[PDB]
Symmetry: C4
């Protein structure tokens, strides 16, 4: 992904397998979320080892929490697209990849999920 | 994959590690199947959180079941290619990736498998 | 990988985590090998579900066995390169990816390994 | 990655899940590090099975140890960028991918991390 020409000047921040329990469905279900945020090196290269010099990666879990807390989600696309739109709404974000999946959708499958990858023009 | 130019306007629906037991071989054997379906955002962006607004991802498991139920499969290519052809036969599908594998083909390997990735022109 | 332009008309045959025990080192050690073979669809699309219609994927494990059986291997590159050269030496092979790794090289790492990816011109 | 045009003439050396314990934070924490080093085939193709013919892959763990041993690291970017700069500082290295992650950053996530991928011009 960091080989893509629009992303070659970026670092990747990533959140792996963030689980939440929520009401979702077209009791609560487990949903597993993965996020990749692409932020420019020129905006996120610390030279004083200070948090203010980078994009705080706590924004990924915060954005998922905000989206899940809105309630009333039926489709995985609704949640996935909302997390991606939230995370794109930041000046220092160039691109985002978000997947959601339901490990318990089917007894004979590990998961079924939805993924988007959005890059700013 | 969603960086590929023909897929940049798509979301990815995915089915991870769908296991089936079937007669296959050039008793039943376990076969593990993975599917990625690429569907255009323009056709699958819900604005009312309704299932009719998207491509129902149950189509992946349904298509595998239909193919496995035909019986008389000897080669992994026969099954893999049939699942891919079935899933391409939908107006809102742009591309599909399908892999099949046999975890028990060899005692000293985790799996041997076959994968195809087909994109509509 | 099947999005690469030279590989778009290929299927991928794969062998996941083939373990062998052998003398290797610059008692026996465990080495884990992964192989991807890219073969043209035009040469490997069965229409009669017969093995003669495809490239038999047993060739991957056979080639690893032949290379390991030669003995006297010190470097991972020597083994990896030999497996790749063996598997390229077939008319219906367009490309091969081979990795070798040593899970026990270091107590505080899962593995250290070497990978090559060779495509015929 | 070995399909990328600048890397097509390279092999990949890789270190998977190197764990360290260190003080890091914007007691010690566990940090998991992954490294991919791209080195030209023309510089690393052994024909006599001798270590002097290749880039010794012990350099990856050595460089991580040197960086961790400097102490006083607050941000993951500081560590990740330092490992990448160290490993690029070798004539036979064409590119490097380095990720760091903290498995224990959040109770409901497997990890949060940072990755860079640097290629020499
Ligand atoms: N695409 C899609 N299909 C479904 N089928 C059942 N639930 C869903 C969902 O959330 N999204
Ligand atoms: N390519 C291929 N080789 C095999 N060798 C044994 N079974 C098979 C199969 O299903 N496909
Ligand atoms: N590149 C490389 N470095 C090593 N250092 C120790 N063993 C090896 C090996 O097999 N290959
Ligand atoms: N990007 C980034 N955000 C953080 N938030 C808390 N620690 C860190 C860190 O090391 N890097």
């Amino acid at each position: 992904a960091l080989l893509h020409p629009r992303l070659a000047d970026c670092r990747r921040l990533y959140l792996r397998n963030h689980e939440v329990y929520m009401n979702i469905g077209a009791g609560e279900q487990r949903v597993v979320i993965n996020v990749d945020l692409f932020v420019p090196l020129a905006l996120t290269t610390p030279v004083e080892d200070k948090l203010r010099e980078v994009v705080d990666y706590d924004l990924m879990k915060q954005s998922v929490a905000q989206c899940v807390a809105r309630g009333h989600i039926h489709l995985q696309e609704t949640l996935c697209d909302a997390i991606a739109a939230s995370l794109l709404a930041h000046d220092a974000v160039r691109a985002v990849r978000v997947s959601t999946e339901k490990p318990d959708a089917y007894p004979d499958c590990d998961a079924v999920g939805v993924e988007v990858f959005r890059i700013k023009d």
